[PDB]
Amino acid sequence: THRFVQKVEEMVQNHMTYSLQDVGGDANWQLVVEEGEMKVYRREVEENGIVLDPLKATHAVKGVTGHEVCNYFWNVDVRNDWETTIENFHVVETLADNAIIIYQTHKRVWPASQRDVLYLSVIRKIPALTENDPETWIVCNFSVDHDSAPLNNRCVRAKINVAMICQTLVSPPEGNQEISRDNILCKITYVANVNPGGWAPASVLRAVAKREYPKFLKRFTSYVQEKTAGKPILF
């Protein structure tokens, strides 16, 4: 019932419609890196000189659930334990138990101006048709406007639409036995569409993205694996 409910539903449903489509067999999409179960793809797109390069990654992370992965991705209290591209951030507003607006500044990359971002971050469970099947969990981070964080002259305001979409697969054990983490897999689709908000040199931006996206996916998924080990499974 907060004011962004309609916008949230739009962004989430657009991800469920378009962000899970195949890119492995798409000629416009290029494999950047493959390491283990992680695959990172990019489509090279510049629009009026501005590098927009859609990014899509997939991963399959043993021993964690989608609910767990999304909780850790969304929870600002653990953000600094895994995120390495930020200088500073704060929660601007709490909209609901599952939705917040965050302001953050990113590490500066020479020669371009420092970027900042202002986004709504929402975590949502998408039920299957019935409880016979696993729900999908999604975290969506998308730029919004807010009076407490106006455009400023110190940073260029980037515009983002990012999603982490998690499906959980279980190999059920025999008879009356308990489910172990060894028999759960979380399939992650991560999509980032970032508009740098103003001019930036293409070669510079592209090398940083190519480095930072897989670094993040490896570091973040390992972090969740580490922190959930020995804890009861949260489905």
Ligand X SMILES: CCCCCCCCCCCCC/C=C/[C@@H](O)[C@H](CO)NC(=O)CCCCCCCCCCCCCCC
**What span, in angstroms and rounded, lies between the C-alpha atoms of 26 and 43?**
10
Q: How far is the CB of 213 from ligand X (least distance, A)?
A: 5
- Which of 68, 194, 214, 228 forms a contact with ligand X (CB under 6 A)? 194
Omega of the bond prior to 111 within 30 degrees of 0, cis?
yes
Which of positions 35-94 make contact with ligand X (CB under 6 A)? 83, 85-86
Cβ neighbour number for residue 35 with a 10 Å cutoff = 11
Q: Which two tokens stand for residue 216?
A: 């993040």
CB of 6 to ligand X, least distance (A): 21
Question: CA 5, CA 147: separation in Å to the nearest integer?
Answer: 18
Decide: is 115 part of the binding site for ligand X (CB under 6 A).
Answer: yes
The continuous run of DSSP H or E covering 195 comes out as: strand 184-195
* Smallest separation, CB 105 to ligand X (Å): 9
Token pair of 38 as six digits:
């992680």
Q: What is d(CA 139, CA 137) in angstroms, rounded to the nearest whole number?
A: 7
Residue 209: closest CA among 43, 98, 74, 73: 43
CB of 142 vs ligand X, minimal distance in Å: 9
Residue with smaller CB distance to ligand X, 86 or 169: 86
Q: Is 152 annotated as a binding residue?
A: no
Residue 104 is assigned to a ligand binding site: yes
Distance separating alpha carbons of residues 73 and 224, to the nearest angstrom: 9
Residues 202-231 that bind ligand X (CB under 6 A): 205, 208-209, 212-213, 216
* CA distance linking residue 221 with residue 200, whole number of Å: 29
Q: Examine residue 8 and tell whether it contacts ligand X (CB under 6 A).
A: no
State which of residues 112, 126, 202, 233 lies at the interface with ligand X (CB under 6 A).
112
Among 58, 65, 136, 141, binds ligand X (CB under 6 A): 141
What 8-state DSSP symbol labels residue 124? E
Size of the site for ligand X (CB under 6 A): 22
Q: Which residues are annotated as a binding site for an N-acylsphing-4-enine?
A: 83, 104, 141, 190
Residues that bind ligand X (CB under 6 A): 83, 85-86, 106-107, 109, 112, 115, 117, 141, 158, 160, 162, 194, 196, 200, 205, 208-209, 212-213, 216
